[PDB]
Amino acid sequence: NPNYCFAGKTSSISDLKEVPRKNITLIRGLGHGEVYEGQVPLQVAVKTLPEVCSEQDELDFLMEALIISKFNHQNIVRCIGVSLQSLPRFILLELMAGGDLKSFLRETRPRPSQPSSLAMLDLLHVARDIACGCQYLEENHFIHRDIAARNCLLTCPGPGRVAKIGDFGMARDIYRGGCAMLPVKWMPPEAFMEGIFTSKTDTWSFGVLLWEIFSLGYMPYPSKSNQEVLEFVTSGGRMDPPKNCPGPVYRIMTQCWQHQPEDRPNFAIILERIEYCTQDPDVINTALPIEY
Numbered sequence: 256n257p258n259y260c261f262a263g264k265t266s267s268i269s270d271l272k273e274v275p276r277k278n279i280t281l282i283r284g285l286g287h288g289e290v291y292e293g294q295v296p297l298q299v300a301v302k303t304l305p306e307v308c309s310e311q312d313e314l315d316f317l318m319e320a321l322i323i324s325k326f327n328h329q330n331i332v333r334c335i336g337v338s339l340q341s342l343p344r345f346i347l348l349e350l351m352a353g354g355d356l357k358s359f360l361r362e363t364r365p366r367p368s369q370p371s372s373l374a375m376l377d378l379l380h381v382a383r384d385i386a387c388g389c390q391y392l393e394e395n396h397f398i399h400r401d402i403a404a405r406n407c408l409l410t411c412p413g414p415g416r417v418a419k420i421g422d423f424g425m426a427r428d429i430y431r432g433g434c435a436m437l438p439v440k441w442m443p444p445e446a447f448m449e450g451i452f453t454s455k456t457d458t459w460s461f462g463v464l465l466w467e468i469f470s471l472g473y474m475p476y477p478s479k480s481n482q483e484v485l486e487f488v489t490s491g492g493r494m495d496p497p498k499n500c501p502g503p504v505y506r507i508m509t510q511c512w513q514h515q516p517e518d519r520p521n522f523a524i525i526l527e528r529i530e531y532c533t534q535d536p537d538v539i540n541t542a543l544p545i546e547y
């Protein structure tokens with residue numbers, strides 16, 4: 256059984272809350288290991304470990320259970336418990352009915368049918384929610400390493416939605432692989448060049464997430480491959496503003512993408528700037544593009 260340290264304290268597999276398998280019912284697949292919607296009545300997302308896997312896969316699975324169970328913050332998905340004493344093994348997460356952020360943005364883009372389905376303020380609230388999660392990780396000296404829209408979840412589709420960081424598979428791998436798998440489009444130069452990760456790693460990635468949000472779910476660096484992005488960013492290149500993106504919001508992005516990690520803002524500053532954007536009528540009165 257592997258050890259794990261967060262906020263100082265060390266924990267073990269024994270500290271995980273084991274839920275009796277009989278209390279757990281699977282309802283439907285969500286996507287593929289496989290994840291199901293389930294009930295324990297508490298509604299849960301059930302992350303499963305394939306019964307056919309390597310011992311490294313097992314260790315990875317246990318470790319992410321330890322990681323998520325030890326966080327306590329409103330913008331990080333909760334772990335209800337685990338079921339490790341039956342096969343296949345389960346990790347039980349808070350079921351975020353809004354689904355993942357990237358799908359949400361893609362499916363909820365304003366259109367002729369729904370012209371105002373989404374507004375700038377909705378995007379700013381998502382951005383603020385995730386930044387608050389990142390600030391919590393930063394102040395607890397946890398480096399996420401893969402801050403990206405695909406790794407965020409929403410509590411519901413409607414205006415009251417809350418965004419949370421929902422996946423920690425990358426930080427898990429490095430805590431203990433391939434180049435064409437590293438999220439190079441979300442990584443700062445010192446990360447993909449030198450393998451150096453610091454709190455300022457997540458700041459850069461958050462800038463890219465910001466772009467994903469205000470582009471409404473487009474893939475970063477449109478039309479560029481990983482290697483072209485690597486060379487582009489290493490040469491000082493940066494993404495243009497998303498369509499209709501207010502200057503104050505783009506400015507947050509460009510500050511997140513400063514070449515020197517020391518020149519990039521910490522998350523307390525990012526949150527201050529996101530707050531200012533939400534107060535600025537010129538920002539929130541800006542209409543999102545309508546997709547025909």
Ligand SMILES: Cc1nc(C(C)(C)O)sc1-c1cnc(N)c(O[C@H](C)c2cc(F)ccc2-n2nccn2)c1
Pocket residue numbers: 285286287290300302332348349350351352353354355358405406407408420421422
């Ligand atoms: C209801 C629901 N619908 C979704 C769609 C199909 C739109 O994508 S995801 C989703 C959901 C809700 N709550 C969770 N706790 C949860 O967790 C998994 C581990 C997860 C966590 C992430 F951070 C990112 C992605 C995924 N993931 N997505 C598919 C498979 N894995 C998923």
